[PDB]
């Protein structure tokens, strides 16, 4: 028997309603963002980035000037979001590689052991494949987190930027220069209500391996989940692009809450996603409604409802407490379904505490039955038999946002000049993967004095022509830096010596299916490795030949199963200090000897 004191000490706590519990969280996220990204560093490096972008030969109407305040603010938000998303894809590709190496042991684990929990199955799989990260708990994920994967903090980016510059009936060059230095009040409000979320491959493996019975199914589920996440992130950047103020999540609680008759209302507005969630907790009954963030022609923020789980009254009267979600709409829906099923055997405190902790801190509940049901529902919502047809909603969100961009610009072009509207609503900042962007690569591998910077080429959500370039800054006055692009048939080595200037390496064309033809073979992604002595910064730039390249349909489970691409060749490296002239070119693996990918032999 127990006194009951330990049970109350491990009960979940409300992290949204408690004002002490909201202040503490907000501080840590702000501290985490400032440590990894400093406002002083980004502002000081503005000039270097501006010259890099201009040095890329971009046709008129398709080039970006970071001399404009709005263009600069959009770029740092874009670069931070892209870097975190890009890092996750490299982690996923590595994880897929380890699973494919040990498919025999993975298949045995998926078949023999099915009575264990989702977390236990994931831990066994991670240990077998010998992945870099072997912890599925929340603390382990936080501990093994890179600098770039830290979510971007809205108010930190928008801090100390001039707002509301007024010039009256002036077309002079100086007045234009002072106008461009400031930013509009709308963009400041958007940045104050913006927070990003980037889920880890370790968090995704639990939904992926909860019903899988084969390694191919487990790999396909992982790819299918991450295809949805990247599409949602692309929507998130586009939302800030148009001239509209984004809605931000809030909780409604009674003004004077009673002990025995208390109700809570949660309205989740995921900035990275096409759908929102409304959850109501009255008594022991939980009711949810999934609405569409597009449309909303009326004053009400909610659009049409696409999934019903009861009657939710959003016109309740009470105090309003505001928060930013650290989970996607799929994850929030997955938990609210499991909570609804298990509402009978959980208390009021457990229901509120488990819900608030997951939405605000991405903390999975400690209940084992609750966790298993949550991941089973998460798999269903991201599979082909989902109650929500995602491809329809993400497509409709894209059309709605482009329509808003056109009417917002045309509304301004009437109120002020074309030049004023252009500097306030750029047309070159459409979508996260559509836009021209840069990736500040980091490197921790040194082979014979050469630092290795890795980059993942693709996958592509748009089709057309793409260009890739590198900018290398090195302390030495004269250096020789090499770039190696690895495919399936072989790798391509190039040598350059120019410094402090962008240089195009790869010209690539991608078709409707999102697959390029790299030297006679269909590829879905490539690996780019850069070797430099004593480098200080290496940046990779990407741009599409045409502005606003058309979209490529998102791939579901059956699309990933149909085509299989080998990624094992991304692991091998080369030693530039031992390179020779005859070894510099496009060569295949049958030319090289076993283990030495540096000399042709």
């Amino acid at each position: 028997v127990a006194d009951g004191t330990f049970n109350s000490m491990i009960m979940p706590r409300a992290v949204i309603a408690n004002e002490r519990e909201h202040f503490m969280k907000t501080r840590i996220d702000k501290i985490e963002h400032d440590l990894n990204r400093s406002a002083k560093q980004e502002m000081m490096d503005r000039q270097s980035l501006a010259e890099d972008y201009n040095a890329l030969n971009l046709a008129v109407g398709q080039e970006i000037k970071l001399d404009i305040a709005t263009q600069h603010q959009l770029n740092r938000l874009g670069s931070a979001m892209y870097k975190a998303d890009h890092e996750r894809e490299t982690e996923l590709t590595d994880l897929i590689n380890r699973i494919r190496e040990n498919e025999v042991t993975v298949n045995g684990i998926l078949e023999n052991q099915k009575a264990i929990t989702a977390a236990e199955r994931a831990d066994l799989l991670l240990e077998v494949v010998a992945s870099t990260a072997k912890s599925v708990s929340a603390a382990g994920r936080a501990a093994a987190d890179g600098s770039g994967v830290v979510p971007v903090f809205g108010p930190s980016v928008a801090n100390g930027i001039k707002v509301g510059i007024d010039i009256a009936d002036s077309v002079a060059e100086a007045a234009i220069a002072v106008k461009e230095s400031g930013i509009i009040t709308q963009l400041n409000d958007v940045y104050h209500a913006f927070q990003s979320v980037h889920v880890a491959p370790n968090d995704v493996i639990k939904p992926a391996a909860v019903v899988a019975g084969t390694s191919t199914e487990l790999i396909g589920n992982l790819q299918a989940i991450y295809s949805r996440l990247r599409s949602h992130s692309d929507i998130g950047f586009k939302k800030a692009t148009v001239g509209d103020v984004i809605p931000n999540s809030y909780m409604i609680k009674p003004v004077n809450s009673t002990e025995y008759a208390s109700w809570q209302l949660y309205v989740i507005h995921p900035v990275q996603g096409s759908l929102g969630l409304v959850v109501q907790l009255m008594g022991d009954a939980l009711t949810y409604n999934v609405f569409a963030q597009y449309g909303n022609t009326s004053a009400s923020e909610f659009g049409k409802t696409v999934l019903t789980g009861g009657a939710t009254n959003t016109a309740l009267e009470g105090t309003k407490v505001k928060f930013q979600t650290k989970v996607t709409a799929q994850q929030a829906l997955a938990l609210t379904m499991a909570l609804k099923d298990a509402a009978s055997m959980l208390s009021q405190g457990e229901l509120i505490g488990y819900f608030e902790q997951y939405i605000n801190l991405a903390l999975e509940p400690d209940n084992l039955s609750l966790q298993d049901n949550m991941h089973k529902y998460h798999h269903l919502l991201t599979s082909q038999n989902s109650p929500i047809d995602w491809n329809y909603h993400d497509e409709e969100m894209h059309k709605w946002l482009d329509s808003r961009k056109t009417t917002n610009y045309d509304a301004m072009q009437k109120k002020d000049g074309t030049v004023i509207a252009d500097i306030h609503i750029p047309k070159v900042f459409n979508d996260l993967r559509n836009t021209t962007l840069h990736c500040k690569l980091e490197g921790k591998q040194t082979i014979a004095g050469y630092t290795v910077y890795e980059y993942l080429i693709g996958p592509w959500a748009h089709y057309g022509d793409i260009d890739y370039s590198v900018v290398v800054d090195t302390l030495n006055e004269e250096t020789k830096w090499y770039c190696e692009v690895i495919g399936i048939d072989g790798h391509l080595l190039i040598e350059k010596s120019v410094q402090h200037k962008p240089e195009k390496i790869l010209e690539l064309t991608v078709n409707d299916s999102g697959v390029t033809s790299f030297n006679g073979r269909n590829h879905d992604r490539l690996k780019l490795k850069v070797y430099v002595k004593d480098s200080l910064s290496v940046k990779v730039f990407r741009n599409w030949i045409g502005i606003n390249a058309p979209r490529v349909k998102t791939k579901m489970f059956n699309d990933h199963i149909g085509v299989k691409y080998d990624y094992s060749h991304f692991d091998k490296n080369i030693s530039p200090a031992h390179l020779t002239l005859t070894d510099l070119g496009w060569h295949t693996w049958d030319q090289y000897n076993a283990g030495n990918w540096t000399n042709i032999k």
Partner: peptide, 15 residues
């Protein structure tokens, strides 16, 4: 060290 600082210092040193 920053990229803009490095470019300025190299210009000062080489000139």
């Amino acid at each position: 060290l920053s990229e803009t600082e490095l470019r300025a210092l190299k210009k000062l040193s080489t000139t």
